[model samples]
Target: DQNHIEQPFYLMGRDKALAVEQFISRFNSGYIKASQELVSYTIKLSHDPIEYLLEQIQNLHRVTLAEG
Candidate 1:
């Protein structure tokens, strides 16, 4: 058997949460250049965080989803 060690990563920033939030939004809106499926699946599973973001962007905002 073989074992490997993972290297530490770094993302120095004043506001990591805000940075992560913006990055996620860009990904969801298909602005990031990558596989479209990334955004598709993100939308498919953003049950809570997405709504929170929408409310943050639009106070008193509401969210609803449906499928047929």
Candidate 2:
């Protein structure tokens, strides 16, 4: 188990609906010297937060897959 971050965001292209922003990915970079070569992504869930997030898990659940 670990911690995650959630927030708000804007719509795509034109202005429309806004939803909860989540980071379905969780993985720290490898322990290396000055290795700041890593990153994750955030998803915009208009609704059904859990359902949307769950799909991503099955899609590619790979945490700590960082590169140094």
Candidate 3:
């Protein structure tokens, strides 16, 4: 018997959750308003999660890069 496979869209776990928390945490406090909205909308495994997350970071990174 050999049945050990990986999952596609793993649900939020401590490690991943913490990593995400840390990622968002690095942003300025003002960003919390937008981050909360994204967390609320976290759904669908239809797209690559890394790319999705990466894009947001880049966008946010663009601003604050918003302040001097």
Candidate 4:
């Protein structure tokens, strides 16, 4: 059978993915403070996920701005 398939794979392994996941979890839940140190650290591991995080942060900022 000749077939083309598209499958998603992790660019980085579990540990780094989990680290970023936990950071994002805390951030979205408002349980942890956002810090540039964390941002830079995660940026070194991946860009797409961090970009999504930034988009979420920007959206949150817009919501607060519109209400305030």
TM-score of each: 0.25, 0.22, 0.25, 0.24
Estimate, for each residue in 1-68, the C-alpha lDDT of model 2 and write its tens digit. 33845333433433332222222122222334225432221323354678878887865655546553
CA RMSD of each candidate after superposition = 15.9, 23.9, 19.9, 17.7
Q: Model 1, 32: alpha-carbon shift in Å?
A: 10
- State the displacement of the C-alpha of residue 64, model 2, in Å, after optimal TM-score superposition: 14
- For each candidate in the order shown, give its overall lDDT on alpha carbons: 0.63, 0.43, 0.69, 0.70
Candidate 1: tens digits of C-alpha lDDT, residues 12-47: 455678688888887774755567656677776765
Query: Tens digits of per-residue lDDT for model 3 on 2-37?
Result: 385655356454467677777777776868668867
Best by lDDT: 4
Give me candidate 3's TM-score against the actual structure.
Answer: 0.25
Best by TM-score: 1
Worst ten-residue run, lDDT, model 2? 18-27
TM-score of 4: 0.24
Greater-TM-score candidate between 1 and 4? 1
